[PDB]
Design a binder for this molecule. Structure first.
Ligand code: 6E3
Ligand code: 6E3
Ligand code: 6E3
Ligand code: 6E3
Ligand code: K
Ligand code: K
Lengths: 274, 274, 274, 274
């Protein structure tokens, strides 16, 4: 019955988005798609030439081979000069094809640039959360790791409790309780950041149990935002956990430890370790 | 007499913006415009060649057909080699035309990319607003829906009352009262967000009536901002309502409901439902 | 002796930035510069060919005309086929020239796009400021006008007093007192926004006079920021005033007024009117 | 044992990122790399043609010279018309090569644009920090200088103490104490900004000494952010200092001074001067 899946995406069911598709497909699929149109549009132009007749020098009438490779030479602006258009109709088709060719190039280039500036937030989230005595006070925790060689500026993470509540009006709704963190922004997120919500008497989760979290349909959202180093621009990552993914009394293993010389170093093997 | 129309744009009358125009026209209009210049500039170059005389091989003197398709072959960098320039003047025109051709390409490409990164904030606003007992306390509400498959990060919406007020100096002005919301930022805007302003004793709208809202020229602005999922960058949407578009005692129908299996799903048919 | 000029730029004297230059020059200058290199690089390549000898078909040995137009045909990828390279040296120069040609295109295109996305904050600031009785309380004011057809989202303006002060340590410095405004953010900046700082007992400028403002070297900075409508991205504008540019008891004329039908309309003639 | 090096990067040891590499290499290296692939891909295509046999007009069978320069003429879309493909296989290779050529162009262009919009935060940080009596109160200071002709909008700097602390649970961790500054945001960063943290009774560093700072492993981070003038977009700079890089009782020399006429001017020689 869980609200938001672990990836942050929700279990809410939806009752031709080409934009989204073109940007999300893997690079091999994209190249295939680009090529697919490229071959198809050249084929449509080849058919347009032969529908005018044998309007191509070096071409045999009815030969798609000659028409297609002439279309390519035209669209691609090669213009070898062996296969050349004949008549006003063919020359008009060439004028339209050349416009298409260099215009499409512009379209492809904007796609490629946009696929290059994909905010690949190389952040790793802990498999589960813990609620343990910190300073002797019970505290809710999970952690993040920067997998990229790079660093993140003004990294602001929020621990958001999304739980179902009822009003005196009778309306049932889910409200987003932003939790008070020990650190809400790590101006430099470069290592592994353990995010903590101390459970004080003001805390929205004060006094809750495994049982009451389930009964309140308690769902914990982790929203991560930050400005990448090599990139410049923002990167965003999300993860969500249910009450079932919380470890009572749980303690994480510090990923940072000291080398023989005395220098501190990070072991990401120890990331999912409690 | 309403201040801001429902789209957010105002009824304030204005007493050659090509930039704006080129970006706002529909894609068919844009393609036509791009083509329009393309044909016109090739025509101007064709005229420039014939003004030099018969400076083109394969061309008849006075033939615009030959000059135009030679211009296209030049601007588009095809260079078949059938129609070729004759003399220093023609060759200088070719050098300028080639610069124009590849330079314009750059201009078109920047237009196309900019038309692709149009923040299409796929947000749907409720037709009207309501003021109903929430928790038994009267509360002002309206709602938003994400029509895009995607999600929105750090979505901050503001309910802004723009009403006319008078000072002891005698100046009449409209001030923007930002209203205290139950949720002012939905870190993840993925479903339908019902925005609420509880009308408490501190609220700027405490104790107002349909009558007094009209007399105070009360106008409600809804400003929506958020960072798109597939996009990365910000999207923005706005809507405005007058006192006449407010429903006293009105109650929205929850768009979220439970499937046979038990999973929650959203019915956007029920969006404009009170 | 004034700190910051009216444009926001300072009177502080500086005791080959091509980037900045290429973006700031007017469009005619930019086109001339682009053309300038284009002609120069083609000339350098033409010289490179003739330094190899008569390595061009249709060319006379020693003819720069033939070499230059062959260079253009190569760099621009025309490849008519009349003037063609001879030998491994010429063909190597062609391979380098073709790389240069299409690579430079990429360079030019990035310049053009960047010159297109110049945040042209079409904001107009009032010539002077005023300090007048508002609600009977003395208040410091100036105003802004959106000259663009478009609107601005989350427009946050700050009235910053930059005045010289001295410490018990003896250090003299200028500090940036951010002033409490009646409206610090106009979520929708579409018309003319009059920015006001009420001079209360907590205000940093409480009780100052024309005389004491001059003696404290009081300088008022206006920083404007907002997210453009047709653009999407941020626009920024700045203006600064000295104590000498402040009008004591001054009152602006409202730019908004009512048409015969009853609709409100804006008269920007009345902008610089006190 | 110092946590973060003076550049902001940390001494934490890491226990094929082409993206990062392509953007970070110097311009000469990038041009060499672009050229490197360009030559290699043309060589692979040349080999592909000769593997089909003597499928090129003007070419000698087995001549890589002819095949390579034909490949260049094809990939670059020159199409002189001297060397032309023979057969369906060669013509198919040409169709793929032309796609590769103009597609790669798009790839290169996105790289070049991205290398152009490198946020070169031309900010200079003071070599060391000082802790001196300001207003008679001990205060922690360092300073920034804008080396670029340009200015920076909404410049927000944070003085972050990263020190090791221990909990009642026994966990040892480093926490990021954001220090209260005299100025935390210089809406216009144009000159030299001296950042100060007054050491009051609430300050996290109140009462610390050179000795106790070392023993608490006190590390001072300086995070700088701002929106560039000619750029538009954000720029970011960072620097970090250890307790060993702090000067007790230290006083900076003002970089701003008055010319003969009376105008204020900045001497950056005096930047690293205490
Ligand atoms: C265009 C581009 C390249 C080459 C790259 O590596 N990435 C980034 O990291 C950003 C910020 C962008 C844009 N892209
Ligand atoms: C360039 C581009 C493409 C291909 C697209 O779908 N959209 C977006 O969603 C963004 C953010 C941009 C830019 N564009
Ligand atoms: C690329 C471009 C165009 C065509 C334009 O009008 N402007 C804008 O308004 C923005 C935001 C950008 C970028 N440019
Ligand atoms: C594209 C570009 C150019 C030409 C330049 O100088 N810089 C900047 O300053 C920005 C903001 C960008 C992008 N680039
Ligand atoms: K060509
Ligand atoms: K040719």
């Amino acid at each position: 019955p869980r609200i938001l899946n672990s990836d942050g995406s929700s279990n809410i069911t939806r009752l031709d988005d080409h934009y989204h598709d073109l940007l999300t497909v893997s690079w091999p699929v994209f190249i295939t798609l680009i090529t697919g149109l490229y071959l198809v549009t050249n084929a449509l132009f080849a058919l347009a030439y032969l529908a005018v007749g044998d309007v191509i020098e070096n071409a045999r009438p009815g030969s798609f081979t000659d028409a297609f490779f002439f279309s390519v030479q035209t669209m691609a602006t090669i213009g070898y000069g062996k296969l050349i258009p004949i008549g006003p109709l063919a020359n008009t088709l060439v004028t339209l094809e050349a416009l298409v060719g260099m215009l499409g190039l512009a379209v492809a280039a904007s796609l490629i640039y946009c696929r290059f500036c994909r905010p690949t937030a190389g952040v790793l989230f802990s498999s589960r959360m813990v609620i343990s005595d910190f300073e002797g006070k019970p505290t809710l925790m999970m952690r993040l790791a920067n997998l990229r060689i790079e660093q993140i500026i003004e990294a602001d993470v929020h621990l958001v409790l999304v739980r179902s509540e009822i009003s005196q009006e009778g309306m049932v709704f889910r409200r987003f309780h932003d939790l008070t963190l020990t650190r809400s922004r790590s101006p430099i997120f470069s290592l592994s950041w353990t995010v903590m919500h101390p459970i004080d008497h003001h805390s929205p989760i004060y006094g809750e149990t495994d049982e009451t979290l389930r009964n309140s349909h308690s769902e914990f959202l982790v929203l991560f935002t930050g400005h990448h180093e090599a990139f410049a621009q923002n990167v965003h990552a999300r993860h969500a956990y249910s009450s079932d993914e919380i470890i009572w009394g749980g303690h994480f293993v510090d990923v940072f430890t000291t080398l023989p010389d005395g220098r501190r170093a990070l072991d990401l093997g120890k990331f999912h370790e409690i």
